[PDB]
Amino acid sequence: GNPLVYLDVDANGKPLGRVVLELKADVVPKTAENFRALCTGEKGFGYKGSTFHRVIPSFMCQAGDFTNHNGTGGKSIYGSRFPDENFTLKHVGPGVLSMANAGPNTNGSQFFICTIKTDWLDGKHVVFGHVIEGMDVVKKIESFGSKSGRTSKKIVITDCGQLS
Ligand SMILES: CSc1ccccc1[C@H]1CCCN1C(=O)CNC(=O)NCc1ccc(N)cc1
Numbered sequence: 001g002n003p004l005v006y007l008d009v010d011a012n013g014k015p016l017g018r019v020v021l022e023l024k025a026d027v028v029p030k031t032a033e034n035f036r037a038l039c040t041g042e043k044g045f046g047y048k049g050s051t052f053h054r055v056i057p058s059f060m061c062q063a064g065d066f067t068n069h070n071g072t073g074g075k076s077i078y079g080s081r082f083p084d085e086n087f088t089l090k091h092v093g094p095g096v097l098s099m100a101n102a103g104p105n106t107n108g109s110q111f112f113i114c115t116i117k118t119d120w121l122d123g124k125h126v127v128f129g130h131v132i133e134g135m136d137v138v139k140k141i142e143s144f145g146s147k148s149g150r151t152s153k154k155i156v157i158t159d160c161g162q163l164s
Contacts (some may be wrong), residue, residue: 003023003025003164005020005039006019006039006162007159008160009052009137009141009156009157012154016141017136017137018137020132021129022132023036027086028088028089031085038064038109039161040161040162046066047066049157051063051065051155052141053149056145057145058142059118061145064108074108084104084105084126090122091117091122093116094114094116094131096129097111097113099126101124101125115142
């Protein structure tokens, strides 16, 4: 079946809790596999110890830049970038997990979790999963954001991996 992966999140060193995600490998196997491997760190690099660098309330929480820590970096398990796999899943509501990008066919490692229906991103960002458990943790992260994206606390993925 589809992989389940987790992110354990801290804010200013204080544990917020765990987010569990289903990766829709049945629909986007290449994109799901990239995220899964970056969660386990099995290639020698990954999300562990990286941060949520842009958080905008009533929009999304963005993370995954483990190279530059500012939204300019990250890489995939395939190379620096890989193509948009398909746009079959939509941004249907809160909890949707989607690839951040810098235009068509520039997927790397950066991702976001939506806190509302962001239907205007349909066809532009590849949706590849959703939150199974821990929307309360997501809502906490959201609360530390601002209109500009700057966080008022340092939000760290302290651990991550695969559950099944
Ligand atoms: C103000 S944030 C924003 C605004 C309009 C549309 C999209 C967004 C944010 C959250 C939804 C995801 N997103 C972006 O992807 C904005 N782009 C980037 O942050 N690009 C930086 C970047 C991303 C991926 C890669 N591989 C390299 C650089």
